Design a protein around this ligand. Structure first.
Ligand SMILES: Cc1cc(CNCCS(C)(=O)=O)ccc1Br
Ligand SMILES: [Mn+2]
Ligand SMILES: [Mn+2]
Lengths: 137, 137
């Protein structure tokens, strides 16, 4: 059967600024870089950045809600979000509809998120403040 | 400090066929569903399906290379690929890299992959046969 996410691959329009964003700004671990891509890790996550001439820099109003959330502790969340804000990182959402989250964009407009909490914690919170029509299995 | 992927959220145009795809076809566990979304798990992966009127059913020629790969064992790979084929699931790429990979599309055209192999395995292969311009850290 399927056992988890093997890797996340993001198409990027310019390799160097994307590597800098994920490694320097977000603090992910850079393992390899070549003319057309890079491999990073974020804890157990394998992230690939793939240089793609088809990737467009996409404003958030032009893309759907597909997004990628990274885990951060309650102790680190606010200062990390504030550092991104002070660095001029663009945002895409303000309303906290799924808990403690900070919504921000990568250089190509990929929709990213910092989130505090697990799925179990989100289910427990939703039992008290459920989304409309919610059923739990 | 970021510690991993917290969740992957896919925007979907029709919630029922997307739930059927991820739960019934791909075997993920459905934890909750509401009028505009669902939460599933696949091992450690927290997957959210979010009903989004902005999601277009997108042909693979019209999207970039961003994609989401799920882990499967080598022993299970061929029968899972055959299950997807029986269900008429379209393929968007042939494998030409190390480790088994099956590249398939979800109902809205999200680019998915089954992959056998870790980052460590990929890096080992790359060290022996580096991509053009490849540098390691
Ligand atoms: C830091 C780094 C950069 C590059 C890009 N070098 C570009 C050189 S040129 C003269 O063609 O502009 C590759 C690997 C690492 Br690691
Ligand atoms: Mn989210
Ligand atoms: Mn891949």
């Amino acid at each position: 059967m399927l056992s988890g996410l093997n890797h996340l691959t993001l198409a990027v329009s310019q390799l160097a600024p994307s590597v800098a964003f994920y490694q320097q700004l977000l603090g992910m671990t850079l393992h390899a870089r070549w003319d057309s891509g890079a491999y990073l890790s974020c804890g157990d996550l394998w992230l690939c950045l793939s240089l793609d001439p088809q990737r467009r820099v996409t404003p958030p109003e032009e893309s759907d809600y597909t997004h990628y959330a990274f885990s951060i502790s309650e102790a680190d969340f606010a200062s990390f979000a504030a550092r991104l804000e002070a660095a001029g990182v663009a945002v895409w959402k303000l309303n906290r509809s799924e808990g403690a989250s900070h919504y921000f964009l990568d250089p190509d407009g990929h929709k990213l998120e910092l989130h505090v909490g697990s799925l179990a914690q989100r289910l427990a919170a939703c039992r008290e403040q459920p989304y409309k029509g919610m059923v739990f299995f």
